[PDB]
């Protein structure tokens, strides 16, 4: 699963990670939130050409084939309605249509709308430590756009997928605005004796997908590129 953020009136590349046994026709689908997934086009591998659905402008979608098994869909003149999850698909001998991974696209008019997340780690309440005997630790990232974020817990230099939970989709700091920044929260729960050990290191790591080196940024502040932002804490003696 990949994340791509692009400004309007530009080009975007969508990569297909699908492994195809027999390569004949490579289908492209688009899934937009609150709508049904639909095929935009498919690629004829033998004839090397694009077959577009009715109503689509020629030249809008182009699938490039750099290598034998490689397929990349290129979009032209990006508009905000191009935003969504793009899948590559193929039929198989089993009479099933396989969809390789997916990639979420977000197109914005102003590139000034992208913000890196501000992460903060919050120490467990002593009450729950006494009452429940288990300490709950909370990390939350705020003021980030677009929606693309990956939150990971790191304990003592190692990632822990157990005893951790994250919200399925981020909140909206400003529900009134469509381009408004997002807020996400996560939880990590460990035993009190493990939390009360000061040698134990706790770090909330958040992967953010921003601008690239090719993207131009003329603004005064720091360039909102693809960035890693972490907030760390140590165990309490009590």
């Amino acid at each position: 699963t990949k994340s791509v953020t692009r400004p309007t009136r530009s080009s975007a590349e969508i990569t297909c990670d699908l492994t195809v046994i027999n390569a004949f026709y490579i289908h492209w689908y688009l899934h937009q939130e609150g709508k049904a997934p639909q095929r935009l086009l498919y690629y004829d591998v033998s004839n090397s050409k694009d077959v577009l659905e009715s109503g689509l402008s020629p030249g809008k979608y182009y699938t490039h084939t750099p290598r034998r098994w490689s397929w990349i869909l290129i979009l032209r003149n990006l508009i905000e309605n191009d935003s969504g999850v793009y899948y590559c698909a193929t039929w198989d001998r089993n009479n099933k249509k396989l969809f390789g991974s997916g990639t979420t696209l977000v197109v914005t008019e102003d590139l000034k709308n992208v913000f890196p997340p501000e992460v903060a780690v919050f120490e467990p309440s002593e009450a729950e430590i006494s009452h429940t005997q288990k300490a709950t630790l909370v990390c939350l990232a705020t003021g980030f756009y677009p929606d693309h974020v990956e939150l990971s817990w790191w304990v003592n230099g190692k990632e822990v997928h157990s005893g951790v939970c994250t919200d399925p989709q981020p909140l909206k700091e400003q529900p009134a605005l469509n381009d408004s920044r997002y807020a996400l929260s996560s939880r990590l729960r460990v035993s009190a004796t493990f939390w009360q050990n000061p040698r134990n290191h706790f770090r909330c790591q958040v992967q953010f997908y921003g601008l690239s080196e090719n993207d131009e940024w003329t603004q005064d502040r720091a360039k909102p590129v693809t960035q890693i932002v972490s907030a760390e804490a140590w165990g309490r003696a009590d």
């Binding site: 699963t1 004949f24 026709y25 289908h27 899934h31 609150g34 709508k35 049904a36 997934p37 639909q38 095929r39 498919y42 077959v51 999850v85 899948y87 039929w91 009479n95 099933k96 249509k97 396989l98 969809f99 991974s101 997916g102 979420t104 903060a120 780690v121 919050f122 120490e123 467990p124 309440s125 009450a127 729950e128 009452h131 429940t132 709950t136 630790l137 909370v138 939350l140 157990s162 005893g163 951790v164 939970c165 994250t166 919200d167 399925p168 989709q169 909140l171 700091e173 529900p175 807020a183 929260s185 939880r187 729960r189 907030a231 804490a233």
Partner: protein, 208 residues
């Protein structure tokens, strides 16, 4: 006319209990296929089961489809309903064009999709609201029964998330949790959850 419609609003069903997803289609073709797919939160599209037009009712693993040919209705049913079964589910139709049979150029016709969020049944409810201190703060609502709804904040200045299921694979202990915070300096952890319906036995720490 080739179409697929899923009317269902997001459905919530507890673990170990059965849930049924309704999908109805309209097709002019004599022979066809119906597909069900599972879309994970990571946006991974996964195949589930396929129902043939002239085939009998398809049942594979924990998935089962009730097929009514005259009614043009397929219903997917998940019996066990694990926690990992929470996903948006889609109903698809194989779309013919050529009259002589299906082609590899043909496409799927997708419904709007129906999201399924399973509720873990909580063995030992211990509803409480704890206040967490930052490193420089946040109120936390945990250990509450899954039968409890979480209503989002009325005030735009305060933010409230939804329930989140934590599972410790060691202790085999599962918990629901919610997070609420605000930029207000004097905001308190007693008032925050007022809009949501909460147990009367909910514990609060002695403030200090």
């Amino acid at each position: 006319a080739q179409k697929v419609t899923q009317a269902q609003s997001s459905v919530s069903m507890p673990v170990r209990k059965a849930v049924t997803l309704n999908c109805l289609y309209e097709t002019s073709w004599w022979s066809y296929y119906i597909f069900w797919y599972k879309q994970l939160p990571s946006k991974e599209m996964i195949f589930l089961i396929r129902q043939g037009s002239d085939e009998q009712n398809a049942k594979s693993g924990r998935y089962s489809v009730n097929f009514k040919k005259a009614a043009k209705s397929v219903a997917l049913t998940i019996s066990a309903l694990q926690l990992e079964d929470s996903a948006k589910y889609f109903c698809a139709l194989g779309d013919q064009i050529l009259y002589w049979g299906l082609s590899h150029t043909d496409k799927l016709i997708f419904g709007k999709g129906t999201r399924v969020t399973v509720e873990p049944n909580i063995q030992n409810p211990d509803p409480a609201v704890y206040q967490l201190r930052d490193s420089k703060s946040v109120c936390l609502f945990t250990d509450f029964d899954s039968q409890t709804n979480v209503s989002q904040s009325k005030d735009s200045d305060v933010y409230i998330t939804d329930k989140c299921v934590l599972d410790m694979r060691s202790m085999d202990f599962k918990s629901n949790s919610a997070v609420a915070w605000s930029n207000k300096s004097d905001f308190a952890c007693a008032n925050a959850f007022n809009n949501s319906i909460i147990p009367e036995d909910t514990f609060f720490p002695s403030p200090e």
